[PDB]
Symmetry: none
């Protein structure tokens, strides 16, 4: 019916689509998730908009628009940099951190939804056989 | 045990690397391969650069450049459409036809090599399960 090439390509595509759908249930886009995640990981010393734009490889306007959107929801905050007052640093809020932590539910729920399609034995057989297939491609 | 997410992602990644490797003998990029195959399947319809860019979901300048590359190799040619001279249609030369058939054979062989990793019963179950999981993801 279908080739493996087709099945794996479509599964890759649909996994990405489903993760995006689940992320949009938090009213978050992929770009926004990456922004929040960047702050979560890298805010310890104080980040400016320019730092964020350079790290994400996006334009100033894109980053400015992203941050305004997130700030309306109180997911990010700003504070003046006392040794460079021409610059604001951008931080992730307590609620922004909780939301980023909640994103992990997406991968987990997706995996459990796949596992639930099969019996425990069928899952073990399928993973063993996928592992064979993977090994042959390496 | 690994997750399905991990296994599917890695299988797709390794498929991509192996397909890229096998493509090297043909001296074409993945975009060029897609273009040639699209022409093979649809040139009878009278295809322009714009039709190709839309099918590929790539930008105009990228597609124009790719077509010049294929044309220097004499894999494709163009002809003005007498019913609409604003349009140049694209066709495969005989070498373009032969090249598509050659790489199709190689990729068909790659698929059969993957099938050969599992027994008949294992393949039947694997295709059935992958089909169900693809369905679960909508």
């Amino acid at each position: 019916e279908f080739t493996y090439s087709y099945l794996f390509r479509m599964i890759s595509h649909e996994m990405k689509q489903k993760a995006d759908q689940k992320l949009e249930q938090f009213d978050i886009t992929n770009e926004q998730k990456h922004t929040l995640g960047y702050l979560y990981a890298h805010q310890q010393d104080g980040l400016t908009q320019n730092d964020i734009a350079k790290a994400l490889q996006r334009t100033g306007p894109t980053v400015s628009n992203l941050l305004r959107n997130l700030e309306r929801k109180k997911l990010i905050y700003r504070y003046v940099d006392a040794q460079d007052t021409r610059r604001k640093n951008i931080g992730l809020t307590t609620s922004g951190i909780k939301l980023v932590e909640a994103f992990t539910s997406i991968f987990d729920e997706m995996e459990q939804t796949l596992v639930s399609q099969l019996s425990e034995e069928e899952n073990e057989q399928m993973k063993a056989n996928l592992t064979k297939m993977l090994s042959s491609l390496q």
